[PDB]
Amino acid sequence: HHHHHHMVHITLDRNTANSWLIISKDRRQVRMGDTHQNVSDNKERFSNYPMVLGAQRFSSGKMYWEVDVTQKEAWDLGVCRDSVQRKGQFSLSPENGFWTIWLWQDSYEAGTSPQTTLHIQVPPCQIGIFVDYEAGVVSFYNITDHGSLIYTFSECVFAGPLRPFFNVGFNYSGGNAAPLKLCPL
């Protein structure tokens, strides 16, 4: 792909984080802690899952960023509406305001309803995410495999400002402690 020139500097919004997440000083990395991180509750925090939003809001234009997923067993990545539900249980779907892919139990899937199987020969260590607001497109790229396409959501109905979306996943296994990291431009 040739989307690299739309690169944006994403930072994580501490206030939206689940209370177990640990965000680095530079706001570019996030991981699951082994306990509650001693923060106050607020209406922005994702309560049920280890999720956090980027601080940046997008309502026009073309945007690109990259995320490091090295040695993780489970994660979700993409974008979402600013007004997505924070509290209780929900599924990641465009109907609920999410445009995402994930790794889970050694398979990759796109967060359609129902979910769509992805075909990845080279397990990615870094994911590229491209958003074209005007066109209604969200695309995912395998940076480990020379930028090959993973998935395109088209005919997107964003219906609001968009925020970068992250889920570090649970660590029931002891094999999923590694962070998500925003990669430098």
Which residues lie near ligand U2R (CB under 6 A)? Answer: 18, 20, 48-50, 170
Q: Cβ of residue 13: shortest distance to ligand U2R, in angstroms?
A: 16
Instruction: Note whether 167 and 50 are within 8 A (CB).
Output: yes
Of 48 and 113, nearer to ligand U2R (C-beta) is: 48
Q: How far is CA 114 from the centre of its chain?
A: 19
How far apart are the C-alpha atoms of 55 and 57, rounded to whole Å?
A: 7
Of 6 and 90, nearer to ligand U2R (C-beta) is: 90
How far apart are the C-alpha atoms of 73 and 82, rounded to whole Å?
A: 27
Of 116 and 173, nearer to ligand U2R (C-beta) is: 173
Q: Which two tokens stand for residue 107?
A: 């398979």
Q: Cβ of residue 105: shortest distance to ligand U2R, in angstroms?
A: 17
With b for 16 or more beta-carbon neighbours within 10 A and e for fewer, the 18-39 pattern comes to: bbbbebeeebbbbbbbeeeeee
Of 18 and 100, nearer to ligand U2R (C-beta) is: 18
Of 36 and 119, nearer to ligand U2R (C-beta) is: 36
Q: Cβ of residue 18: shortest distance to ligand U2R, in angstroms?
A: 4
Q: Cβ of residue 23: shortest distance to ligand U2R, in angstroms?
A: 14
Q: Cβ of residue 80: shortest distance to ligand U2R, in angstroms?
A: 16
Shortest CA distance to 100 belongs to which of 119, 75, 126, 123? 75
